[PDB]
Amino acid sequence: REIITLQLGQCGNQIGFEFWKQLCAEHGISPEGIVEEFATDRKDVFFYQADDEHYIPRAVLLDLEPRVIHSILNSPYAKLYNPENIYLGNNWASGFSQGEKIHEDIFDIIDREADGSDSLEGFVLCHSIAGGTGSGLGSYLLERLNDRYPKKLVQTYSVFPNQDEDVVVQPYNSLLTLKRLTQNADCVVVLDNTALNRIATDRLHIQNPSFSQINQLVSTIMSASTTTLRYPGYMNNDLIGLIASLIPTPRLHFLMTGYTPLTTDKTTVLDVMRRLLQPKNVMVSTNHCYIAILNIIQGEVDPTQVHKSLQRIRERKLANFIPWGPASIQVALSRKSPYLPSAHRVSGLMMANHTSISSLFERTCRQYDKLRKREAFLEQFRKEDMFKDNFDEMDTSREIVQQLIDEYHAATRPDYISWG
Amino acid sequence: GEFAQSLSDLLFEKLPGELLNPLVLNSVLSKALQCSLHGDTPHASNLSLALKYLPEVPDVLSCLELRYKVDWPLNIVITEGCVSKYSGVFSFLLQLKLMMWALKDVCFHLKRTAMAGSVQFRQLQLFKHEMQHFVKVIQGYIANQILHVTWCEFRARLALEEIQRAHAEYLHKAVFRGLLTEKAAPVMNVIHSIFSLVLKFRSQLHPNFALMQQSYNTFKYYSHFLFKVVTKLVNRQPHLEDFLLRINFNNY
C-alpha cells in the first residue's frame, strides 16, 4: 500500500532528494505541491492530499552532523515538504551508540509519520551501507522497526560497499548491518558501488563524480519498481502482494535488479527479456542459477508479444533455475506514466532471486576474516569495545551469512529439506 | 487495481450469516474504491451485484456475481446474456484470488514469529511456497490468456451486426479460456482439490506436522497428474500451452 521513505546515510539522503525531485518531475506537480494544468490517477502512495491539492511527500530525514540539509534549505524543495520532518558518525559502533541515546525522539518521529499516513503497510528505506552517518544508526533503526512493527513491512533500497579492495572499516560495518538486515528487515534490494560505477563508466565518460549519477540510477530504479504502485495498474499494487511473488526462498530475499535502458536516450519484449536476463545489463554483481524470476514491462507494449516472449524465454532455457519447487519466471505488465518528461517510454525491469549474489557476499565473508587475521584494520575503536566485550557479534554475523550461503547452495538443489 | 486487490481480502474475512443483504456487500465496495482513487468515476455508477451462495465455510464455492449495467438504446450491443458469463468468470477469478490470499495469510503469520526458527519452521514453509507458486502461475495464466491475447481481438476487429458477432466471439473465447467450458473440464477437476488443500492449509496453523506433510503429498500428486492431463488437451488447446510451460521446468 502506502510506504514512507526513511532516508539515512549521505548517499541515502542524496538518493532521497533525487527521488523526490524525480517524482516532482514525474507527476504533474509544482515545487510547492500545487496541482498543475497538465496533470484520475492515484497520487496517494507517497503524497498526502494536503491543503490546496498540495501533494506533500511523506518522508523521514535522519542523519548525524548535518551536511545536505543546507542544499535542501536553499532550494525550492524546502517549500515542497518539511512541515517538520527533518532531524539533524563514521563507524557502525559510534552510530549504534549515538542512536541508542536518542531512540525515543526518532521513534516519536516514526510514530508521527505513521499517524500522518492514512494506510500504513510498510516502511521503505532509502539507505547507503557505510555512507558514514548511515552505518550503525540504520541498523539500530532496523532493530527498532522490527521490535515495534512486526506487522508491517521493512523495505531497503540500498547500495553495498564494494571497492574491489579503499576503506578498511566498511566490511565490519556492512557485515553487521547485513546481519541486522537479515533478522530485522523484510526485503532487501541490493546494489553495489562497483556495478553501478562500471555501468556508469560504460554508458558515460566519467570516473570521479560517481555519486551524482548513482543518485540518478537509483532514483530511476526506485521509480520503476514503484511505477505500478504509484500509477494504477491492476496487479498486486499493494507492496505485500507484489513482494509476495518476488521472494521464493524465505531467507534468501536479496533480489536482482536489472534495467534494459542503461541510458534512456524499435524493440520487442523478447529482445529486452534476452537483454534483461544477461548480468551485464543488471546493476548487481560454479553452479549459479535463479530460484524465481519476475519481470515488469512498461511502455508501448503489445500483450500477445508478452505471451510469445514468455513462451520462448522459458522454452529456450535462458531462465536458469533448479528449484525445490516449481518456482519459475513470471511476466508482469505496467502502464508507462502519462506526462513523463523522459522520452523513449519503453523500459524493462527484473526482480529475481539469484544465488550468484552469494559469491559477492563471500567476498565480504573473506574480507572481515582477512581483516580479523591481520589485526590493524578492526582499529580497536572504543565504541566497538562497549558494543560487545567479546567481539562475538561479528562472529554471529559471519555465522548468519554462512547459513545464508549454505541456504543459497541448498536452494540450487531440488531439496530444501536439508540446508547446512 | 487496489479496488479488486482490496475487495477480495476484505471479502474473504466473511466467507456464517454475513454478506446476505445488500447493505454489507455495498459497504466493502466503498472501502475498495477509496484505496485506489481510480473509482468514483461515472463508469463506476450503475452496477448490479447479486449472490448465488451463502457462506458455510470445507466448501470451496464463492458468491458475488458482479455485473456492469448499460441503458436501453445501448442494451442491444451490450446485452443481458453476456453479463451472466462475465459474472461467471468474475466469481472464478475471486475463487482464484482466495488461494493467494490464504497462502499470504499463512506466510505473514509465519513472518511475525521469525522468536527463532527451527526444523518445523522450514518443513512448514516449503509447502507454502510450493502452493504459492502454483497459485501465481495459474493467476499469471489467467492474466495472459483472458486479459491479454484475446483482448487484442475486439480492438482492431472494430469496423452493426459485426459488432455483435465480434462481442459474442470475444465473450465465447473469454468463457473458453476461463475453465468454464467442457473442453477444459479435466483441468477444472484438479482445481477444486487445490482450493480445498490450500484452505485446509490455512486451517492448519503446529497442530500436526504429518498432517501438513500428507496435504503436501496429495497436492504434489494432483499437480504431477495435471502435468500429464494438460498435455493430452493440446493433442486434442493453444491457450493451455501457456500453463503447460509455466508449470514444467523442474516438475516431473
Tab-separated table of N, CA and C in Angstrom, chain A residues 1 40-44 121 150-153 183 228-229 232-238 240-241 244-245 247-250 291-292 294 302-304 306-307 310-312 314-315 317 319-331 333 335 414 416-419, chain B residues 1-3 5-6 9 32 34-39 41 100 104 108 110-112 114 118-119 122-123 125-130 132-134 136-137 139-140 143-145 147-152 155 216 220 238-239 241-251:
chain	number	residue	atom	x	y	z
A	1	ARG	N	0.817	-1.207	0.000
A	1	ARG	CA	0.000	0.000	0.000
A	1	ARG	C	0.854	1.262	0.000
A	40	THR	N	-9.158	9.773	-13.074
A	40	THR	CA	-7.987	10.345	-12.422
A	40	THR	C	-6.984	9.263	-12.038
A	41	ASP	N	-5.717	9.649	-11.925
A	41	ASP	CA	-4.686	8.749	-11.432
A	41	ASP	C	-4.514	8.902	-9.923
A	42	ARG	N	-3.798	7.955	-9.322
A	42	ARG	CA	-3.555	7.963	-7.886
A	42	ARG	C	-2.251	8.687	-7.577
A	43	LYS	N	-2.305	9.612	-6.617
A	43	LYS	CA	-1.122	10.286	-6.087
A	43	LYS	C	-1.107	10.165	-4.566
A	44	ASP	N	-1.361	8.960	-4.057
A	44	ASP	CA	-1.550	8.759	-2.627
A	44	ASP	C	-0.591	7.711	-2.071
A	121	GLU	N	1.424	0.292	5.640
A	121	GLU	CA	1.686	-1.098	5.287
A	121	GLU	C	3.167	-1.438	5.342
A	150	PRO	N	6.223	-5.584	13.985
A	150	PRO	CA	6.339	-6.882	13.311
A	150	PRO	C	5.236	-7.091	12.288
A	151	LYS	N	4.175	-6.291	12.359
A	151	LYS	CA	3.032	-6.466	11.476
A	151	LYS	C	3.149	-5.674	10.182
A	152	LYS	N	4.176	-4.837	10.038
A	152	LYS	CA	4.364	-4.028	8.843
A	152	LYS	C	5.641	-4.444	8.114
A	153	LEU	N	5.807	-3.922	6.900
A	153	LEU	CA	6.948	-4.245	6.054
A	153	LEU	C	8.132	-3.330	6.333
A	183	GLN	N	17.852	-10.294	9.910
A	183	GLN	CA	16.944	-10.588	11.016
A	183	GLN	C	15.859	-9.540	11.236
A	228	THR	N	4.103	0.700	-10.845
A	228	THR	CA	2.793	0.058	-10.794
A	228	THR	C	2.032	0.379	-9.510
A	229	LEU	N	2.720	0.821	-8.457
A	229	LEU	CA	2.027	1.236	-7.243
A	229	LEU	C	1.545	2.677	-7.345
A	232	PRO	N	-1.846	3.548	-11.392
A	232	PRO	CA	-2.665	2.347	-11.182
A	232	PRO	C	-2.591	1.367	-12.343
A	233	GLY	N	-2.056	0.189	-12.049
A	233	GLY	CA	-2.307	-0.988	-12.851
A	233	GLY	C	-3.429	-1.745	-12.177
A	234	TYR	N	-3.424	-3.067	-12.294
A	234	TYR	CA	-4.406	-3.846	-11.549
A	234	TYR	C	-3.830	-5.167	-11.051
A	235	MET	N	-2.514	-5.338	-11.106
A	235	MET	CA	-1.847	-6.472	-10.486
A	235	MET	C	-1.096	-5.979	-9.254
A	236	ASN	N	-1.382	-6.633	-8.114
A	236	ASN	CA	-0.615	-6.631	-6.854
A	236	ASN	C	-0.040	-5.266	-6.470
A	237	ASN	N	-0.904	-4.251	-6.481
A	237	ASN	CA	-0.480	-2.873	-6.289
A	237	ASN	C	-0.257	-2.527	-4.824
A	238	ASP	N	-0.586	-3.436	-3.915
A	238	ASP	CA	-0.089	-3.392	-2.551
A	238	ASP	C	1.328	-3.952	-2.528
A	240	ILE	N	2.692	-5.822	-0.241
A	240	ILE	CA	2.659	-7.195	0.259
A	240	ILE	C	2.442	-8.202	-0.874
A	241	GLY	N	1.481	-7.943	-1.766
A	241	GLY	CA	1.231	-8.869	-2.857
A	241	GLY	C	2.286	-8.814	-3.943
A	244	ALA	N	5.255	-10.601	-2.531
A	244	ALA	CA	4.850	-11.979	-2.267
A	244	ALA	C	5.308	-12.941	-3.358
A	245	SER	N	5.249	-12.519	-4.621
A	245	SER	CA	5.782	-13.356	-5.689
A	245	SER	C	7.296	-13.227	-5.807
A	247	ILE	N	9.841	-13.084	-3.549
A	247	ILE	CA	10.720	-13.844	-2.663
A	247	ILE	C	10.320	-15.312	-2.726
A	248	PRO	N	11.113	-16.184	-3.355
A	248	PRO	CA	10.771	-17.611	-3.362
A	248	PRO	C	11.297	-18.355	-2.147
A	249	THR	N	12.422	-17.895	-1.605
A	249	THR	CA	13.105	-18.612	-0.544
A	249	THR	C	13.107	-17.681	0.660
A	250	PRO	N	12.568	-18.128	1.796
A	250	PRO	CA	12.201	-17.194	2.873
A	250	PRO	C	13.368	-16.604	3.637
A	291	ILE	N	16.163	-18.785	-8.499
A	291	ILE	CA	15.127	-19.598	-7.866
A	291	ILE	C	13.751	-19.257	-8.424
A	292	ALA	N	13.402	-17.971	-8.437
A	292	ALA	CA	12.222	-17.496	-9.146
A	292	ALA	C	12.531	-16.144	-9.766
A	294	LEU	N	10.869	-12.692	-11.852
A	294	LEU	CA	9.731	-11.912	-12.310
A	294	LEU	C	10.250	-10.666	-13.011
A	302	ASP	N	2.643	-4.575	-26.939
A	302	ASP	CA	1.578	-5.447	-27.423
A	302	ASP	C	1.504	-6.686	-26.539
A	303	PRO	N	0.344	-6.980	-25.938
A	303	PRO	CA	0.269	-8.068	-24.943
A	303	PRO	C	0.460	-9.475	-25.505
A	304	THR	N	0.174	-9.701	-26.788
A	304	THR	CA	0.415	-11.013	-27.380
A	304	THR	C	1.912	-11.249	-27.583
A	306	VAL	N	3.925	-10.333	-25.180
A	306	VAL	CA	4.261	-10.790	-23.826
A	306	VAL	C	4.025	-12.295	-23.693
A	307	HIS	N	2.899	-12.784	-24.250
A	307	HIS	CA	2.672	-14.215	-24.484
A	307	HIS	C	3.863	-14.900	-25.143
A	310	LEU	N	7.199	-14.860	-23.314
A	310	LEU	CA	7.265	-15.771	-22.173
A	310	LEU	C	7.437	-17.216	-22.626
A	311	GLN	N	6.738	-17.588	-23.709
A	311	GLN	CA	6.848	-18.935	-24.267
A	311	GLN	C	8.285	-19.241	-24.679
A	312	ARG	N	8.889	-18.341	-25.461
A	312	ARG	CA	10.218	-18.608	-25.994
A	312	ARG	C	11.304	-18.467	-24.929
A	314	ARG	N	11.009	-19.174	-21.594
A	314	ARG	CA	11.127	-20.343	-20.725
A	314	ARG	C	11.517	-21.596	-21.510
A	315	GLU	N	11.101	-21.714	-22.780
A	315	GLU	CA	11.451	-22.937	-23.500
A	315	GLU	C	12.884	-22.969	-24.018
A	317	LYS	N	15.468	-22.177	-22.452
A	317	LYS	CA	16.292	-22.479	-21.275
A	317	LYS	C	17.276	-21.349	-20.966
A	319	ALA	N	15.967	-18.977	-18.834
A	319	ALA	CA	15.566	-18.841	-17.442
A	319	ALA	C	16.161	-20.041	-16.724
A	320	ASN	N	17.239	-19.807	-15.984
A	320	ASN	CA	18.046	-20.885	-15.431
A	320	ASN	C	17.761	-21.009	-13.943
A	321	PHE	N	17.145	-22.121	-13.564
A	321	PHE	CA	16.708	-22.359	-12.198
A	321	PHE	C	16.533	-23.851	-11.975
A	322	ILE	N	17.096	-24.338	-10.877
A	322	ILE	CA	16.858	-25.696	-10.399
A	322	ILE	C	16.261	-25.580	-9.001
A	323	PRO	N	14.945	-25.431	-8.863
A	323	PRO	CA	14.374	-25.213	-7.531
A	323	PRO	C	13.933	-26.506	-6.864
A	324	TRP	N	13.605	-26.393	-5.578
A	324	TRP	CA	12.972	-27.469	-4.832
A	324	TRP	C	11.457	-27.429	-4.949
A	325	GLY	N	10.923	-26.468	-5.693
A	325	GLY	CA	9.534	-26.460	-6.064
A	325	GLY	C	9.383	-26.220	-7.551
A	326	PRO	N	8.227	-25.707	-7.961
A	326	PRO	CA	8.017	-25.361	-9.373
A	326	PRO	C	8.332	-23.913	-9.728
A	327	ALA	N	9.068	-23.199	-8.866
A	327	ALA	CA	9.133	-21.740	-8.932
A	327	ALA	C	9.852	-21.275	-10.191
A	328	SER	N	9.285	-20.265	-10.848
A	328	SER	CA	9.513	-20.059	-12.272
A	328	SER	C	9.716	-18.586	-12.588
A	329	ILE	N	9.882	-18.318	-13.886
A	329	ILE	CA	9.919	-16.957	-14.399
A	329	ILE	C	8.492	-16.459	-14.622
A	330	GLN	N	8.258	-15.198	-14.270
A	330	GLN	CA	6.935	-14.594	-14.281
A	330	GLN	C	6.962	-13.328	-15.120
A	331	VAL	N	5.924	-13.127	-15.926
A	331	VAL	CA	5.757	-11.872	-16.648
A	331	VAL	C	4.816	-10.970	-15.871
A	333	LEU	N	3.036	-6.765	-16.395
A	333	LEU	CA	2.845	-5.618	-17.266
A	333	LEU	C	2.555	-4.393	-16.418
A	335	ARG	N	1.651	0.097	-16.895
A	335	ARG	CA	1.357	1.230	-17.754
A	335	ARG	C	2.446	2.271	-17.561
A	414	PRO	N	17.427	-29.585	-5.674
A	414	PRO	CA	15.977	-29.837	-5.638
A	414	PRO	C	15.442	-30.204	-4.260
A	416	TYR	N	15.155	-28.745	-0.251
A	416	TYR	CA	15.336	-27.757	0.803
A	416	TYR	C	14.803	-28.329	2.108
A	417	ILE	N	14.757	-29.658	2.201
A	417	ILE	CA	14.557	-30.329	3.478
A	417	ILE	C	15.886	-30.473	4.206
A	418	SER	N	16.978	-30.066	3.564
A	418	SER	CA	18.288	-30.004	4.194
A	418	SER	C	19.039	-28.771	3.703
A	419	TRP	N	19.348	-27.860	4.625
A	419	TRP	CA	20.413	-26.893	4.392
A	419	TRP	C	21.456	-27.046	5.490
B	1	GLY	N	-7.230	-1.565	-10.125
B	1	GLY	CA	-6.243	-2.027	-9.166
B	1	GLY	C	-6.322	-1.275	-7.872
B	2	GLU	N	-6.158	-2.011	-6.765
B	2	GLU	CA	-6.470	-1.629	-5.388
B	2	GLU	C	-7.943	-1.319	-5.195
B	3	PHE	N	-8.774	-1.744	-6.140
B	3	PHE	CA	-10.197	-1.967	-5.999
B	3	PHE	C	-10.489	-3.448	-5.815
B	5	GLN	N	-8.000	-5.834	-5.546
B	5	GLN	CA	-6.987	-6.271	-4.588
B	5	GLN	C	-7.293	-5.844	-3.158
B	6	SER	N	-8.186	-4.873	-2.964
B	6	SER	CA	-8.715	-4.552	-1.650
B	6	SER	C	-10.081	-5.161	-1.382
B	9	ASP	N	-9.613	-9.312	-0.288
B	9	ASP	CA	-9.069	-9.593	1.040
B	9	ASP	C	-10.079	-9.289	2.139
B	32	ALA	N	-13.175	-0.359	-0.889
B	32	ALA	CA	-12.351	-0.747	-2.026
B	32	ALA	C	-12.063	0.417	-2.966
B	34	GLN	N	-11.902	3.801	-2.231
B	34	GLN	CA	-11.065	4.839	-1.634
B	34	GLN	C	-9.605	4.434	-1.545
B	35	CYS	N	-9.328	3.139	-1.583
B	35	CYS	CA	-7.978	2.611	-1.532
B	35	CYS	C	-7.243	2.726	-2.862
B	36	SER	N	-7.903	3.203	-3.916
B	36	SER	CA	-7.266	3.307	-5.224
B	36	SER	C	-7.347	4.682	-5.860
B	37	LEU	N	-8.407	5.460	-5.597
B	37	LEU	CA	-8.688	6.762	-6.225
B	37	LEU	C	-8.706	6.679	-7.754
B	38	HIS	N	-9.112	5.517	-8.274
B	38	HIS	CA	-9.403	5.336	-9.686
B	38	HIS	C	-10.870	5.036	-9.927
B	39	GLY	N	-11.590	4.574	-8.900
B	39	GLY	CA	-13.034	4.602	-8.916
B	39	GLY	C	-13.582	5.983	-8.594
B	41	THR	N	-15.787	7.142	-10.559
B	41	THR	CA	-15.998	7.557	-11.933
B	41	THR	C	-17.464	7.396	-12.304
B	100	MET	N	-4.196	-17.404	-3.170
B	100	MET	CA	-3.095	-16.500	-2.865
B	100	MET	C	-3.357	-15.675	-1.615
B	104	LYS	N	-0.833	-16.094	1.475
B	104	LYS	CA	-0.263	-14.862	2.010
B	104	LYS	C	-0.517	-14.741	3.509
B	108	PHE	N	2.434	-14.648	6.238
B	108	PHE	CA	2.606	-13.492	7.108
B	108	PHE	C	2.463	-13.863	8.578
B	110	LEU	N	3.614	-16.644	9.600
B	110	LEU	CA	4.951	-17.177	9.843
B	110	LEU	C	6.004	-16.071	9.958
B	111	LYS	N	5.779	-14.907	9.326
B	111	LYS	CA	6.764	-13.820	9.375
B	111	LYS	C	6.928	-13.260	10.785
B	112	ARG	N	5.822	-13.095	11.513
B	112	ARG	CA	5.846	-12.410	12.799
B	112	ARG	C	6.484	-13.233	13.911
B	114	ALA	N	9.230	-15.115	13.324
B	114	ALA	CA	10.605	-15.373	12.913
B	114	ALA	C	11.600	-14.709	13.861
B	118	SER	N	13.332	-23.051	13.378
B	118	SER	CA	13.537	-24.452	13.729
B	118	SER	C	13.371	-25.297	12.471
B	119	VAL	N	13.264	-26.612	12.673
B	119	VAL	CA	13.096	-27.533	11.549
B	119	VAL	C	11.622	-27.633	11.162
B	122	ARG	N	10.944	-24.709	8.708
B	122	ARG	CA	11.328	-24.868	7.306
B	122	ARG	C	10.472	-25.913	6.592
B	123	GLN	N	10.193	-27.042	7.259
B	123	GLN	CA	9.337	-28.039	6.630
B	123	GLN	C	7.893	-27.560	6.502
B	125	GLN	N	7.229	-24.125	5.848
B	125	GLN	CA	7.222	-23.075	4.829
B	125	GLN	C	7.404	-23.591	3.405
B	126	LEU	N	8.085	-24.730	3.205
B	126	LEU	CA	8.326	-25.150	1.821
B	126	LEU	C	7.034	-25.609	1.135
B	127	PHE	N	6.086	-26.149	1.916
B	127	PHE	CA	4.741	-26.451	1.417
B	127	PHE	C	4.044	-25.175	0.957
B	128	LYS	N	4.187	-24.119	1.763
B	128	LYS	CA	3.569	-22.830	1.490
B	128	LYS	C	4.108	-22.229	0.202
B	129	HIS	N	5.426	-22.296	-0.004
B	129	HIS	CA	5.986	-21.711	-1.222
B	129	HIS	C	5.628	-22.532	-2.462
B	130	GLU	N	5.529	-23.863	-2.308
B	130	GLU	CA	5.014	-24.745	-3.360
B	130	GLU	C	3.641	-24.276	-3.854
B	132	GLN	N	2.161	-21.419	-3.167
B	132	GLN	CA	2.257	-20.013	-3.551
B	132	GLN	C	2.657	-19.866	-5.011
B	133	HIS	N	3.604	-20.686	-5.469
B	133	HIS	CA	3.981	-20.579	-6.867
B	133	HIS	C	2.871	-21.124	-7.759
B	134	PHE	N	2.193	-22.194	-7.301
B	134	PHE	CA	1.124	-22.781	-8.113
B	134	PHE	C	0.001	-21.772	-8.349
B	136	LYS	N	0.451	-18.523	-8.209
B	136	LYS	CA	0.952	-17.406	-9.013
B	136	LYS	C	1.004	-17.711	-10.510
B	137	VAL	N	1.348	-18.935	-10.916
B	137	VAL	CA	1.307	-19.156	-12.368
B	137	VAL	C	-0.076	-19.498	-12.891
B	139	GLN	N	-2.600	-17.821	-11.762
B	139	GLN	CA	-3.036	-16.429	-11.838
B	139	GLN	C	-2.404	-15.690	-13.013
B	140	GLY	N	-1.118	-15.924	-13.286
B	140	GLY	CA	-0.486	-15.311	-14.442
B	140	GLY	C	-0.957	-15.901	-15.754
B	143	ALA	N	-3.956	-14.043	-16.256
B	143	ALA	CA	-3.521	-12.710	-16.654
B	143	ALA	C	-3.037	-12.649	-18.097
B	144	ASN	N	-2.516	-13.745	-18.643
B	144	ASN	CA	-2.016	-13.761	-20.012
B	144	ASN	C	-3.075	-14.139	-21.040
B	145	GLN	N	-3.981	-15.063	-20.712
B	145	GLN	CA	-4.903	-15.560	-21.732
B	145	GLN	C	-6.179	-14.724	-21.812
B	147	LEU	N	-6.926	-11.849	-20.303
B	147	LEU	CA	-6.759	-10.406	-20.246
B	147	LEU	C	-5.974	-9.827	-21.410
B	148	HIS	N	-5.187	-10.635	-22.119
B	148	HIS	CA	-4.161	-10.079	-22.992
B	148	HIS	C	-4.136	-10.613	-24.419
B	149	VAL	N	-4.371	-11.907	-24.653
B	149	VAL	CA	-4.179	-12.382	-26.025
B	149	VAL	C	-5.467	-12.293	-26.851
B	150	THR	N	-6.633	-12.533	-26.247
B	150	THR	CA	-7.901	-12.377	-26.943
B	150	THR	C	-8.521	-11.008	-26.722
B	151	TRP	N	-7.939	-10.195	-25.841
B	151	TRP	CA	-8.276	-8.784	-25.727
B	151	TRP	C	-7.546	-7.951	-26.779
B	152	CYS	N	-6.526	-8.524	-27.429
B	152	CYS	CA	-6.004	-7.940	-28.660
B	152	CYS	C	-7.044	-7.986	-29.772
B	155	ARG	N	-10.530	-5.085	-30.704
B	155	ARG	CA	-9.981	-3.731	-30.700
B	155	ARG	C	-9.493	-3.269	-32.067
B	216	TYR	N	0.622	-31.946	1.599
B	216	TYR	CA	1.662	-31.693	0.603
B	216	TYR	C	1.791	-32.829	-0.408
B	220	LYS	N	1.089	-32.550	-4.396
B	220	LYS	CA	2.103	-32.895	-5.389
B	220	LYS	C	1.608	-33.974	-6.343
B	238	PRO	N	-4.335	-24.327	-27.943
B	238	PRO	CA	-3.169	-23.429	-27.998
B	238	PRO	C	-3.055	-22.506	-26.798
B	239	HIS	N	-4.161	-22.214	-26.109
B	239	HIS	CA	-4.084	-21.356	-24.934
B	239	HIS	C	-3.504	-22.084	-23.726
B	241	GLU	N	-1.119	-24.128	-23.684
B	241	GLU	CA	0.334	-24.187	-23.835
B	241	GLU	C	1.031	-23.214	-22.888
B	242	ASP	N	0.384	-22.072	-22.621
B	242	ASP	CA	0.899	-21.078	-21.684
B	242	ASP	C	1.035	-21.649	-20.274
B	243	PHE	N	0.038	-22.410	-19.807
B	243	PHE	CA	0.125	-23.011	-18.474
B	243	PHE	C	1.084	-24.195	-18.440
B	244	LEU	N	1.017	-25.059	-19.470
B	244	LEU	CA	1.892	-26.230	-19.561
B	244	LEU	C	3.363	-25.839	-19.564
B	245	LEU	N	3.679	-24.673	-20.116
B	245	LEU	CA	5.021	-24.130	-19.994
B	245	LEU	C	5.309	-23.568	-18.602
B	246	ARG	N	4.353	-22.845	-17.995
B	246	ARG	CA	4.617	-22.202	-16.702
B	246	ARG	C	4.824	-23.205	-15.571
B	247	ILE	N	4.264	-24.412	-15.685
B	247	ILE	CA	4.341	-25.327	-14.547
B	247	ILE	C	5.515	-26.318	-14.638
B	248	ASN	N	6.052	-26.576	-15.831
B	248	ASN	CA	7.012	-27.652	-16.074
B	248	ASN	C	8.407	-27.092	-16.339
B	249	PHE	N	9.307	-27.112	-15.342
B	249	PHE	CA	10.692	-26.946	-15.778
B	249	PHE	C	11.500	-27.994	-15.036
B	250	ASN	N	11.216	-28.059	-13.734
B	250	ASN	CA	11.761	-28.996	-12.764
B	250	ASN	C	10.689	-29.954	-12.287
B	251	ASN	N	9.446	-29.708	-12.685
B	251	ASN	CA	8.322	-30.582	-12.395
B	251	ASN	C	8.439	-31.867	-13.201
